[PDB]
Amino acid sequence: PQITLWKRPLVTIRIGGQLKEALLNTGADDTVLEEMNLPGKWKPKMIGGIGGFIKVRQYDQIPIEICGHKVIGTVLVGPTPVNIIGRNLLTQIGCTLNF
Amino acid sequence: PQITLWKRPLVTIRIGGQLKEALLNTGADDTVLEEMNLPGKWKPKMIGGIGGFIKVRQYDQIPIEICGHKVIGTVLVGPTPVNIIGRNLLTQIGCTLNF
């Protein structure tokens, strides 16, 4: 699809077969999800943003579907105010910026 | 152009006569540049993201050329970790996400 940028580019994602709204974010290296009790092994990570750093849990090889497109990779979980799909998954779904 | 996302989408911009490198950021509502001088009146604002809130100077109706495309709009200046082009200017240069 084509997504204009008049509004926040929010799309539906599926992680654990369960559905969330997430922001397609070219300014994010990684994918960060709002706090959720995801099962699996994780490692601690600190990620940086506009205001400083936050601590998150890093889960690897997690299947995720983005607007119907299957992906699998690293997902970070922590106290982000919005679910964020970052470049690690945007590349897997063949997402580009065009102008 | 069409820009893939395996690397950070950094482009050259010209603003107030000066060349800088900036990140095309669909996850930002606003454009925020690293500390610099700009001509004209500004107003104090705060903006937020991951890691919290920072204080910025808001300059209105500022011309900026982004990867060869002209925009004129709001530019925030403050302690951002990187120069960010947000949706307010991405829309002006006709940028969409596509997959």
Partner: peptide, 10 residues
């Protein structure tokens, strides 16, 4: 209301 979701991983 946060609005600028720059994110970087070290």
């Amino acid at each position: 209301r946060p609005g600028n979701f720059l994110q970087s991983s070290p």
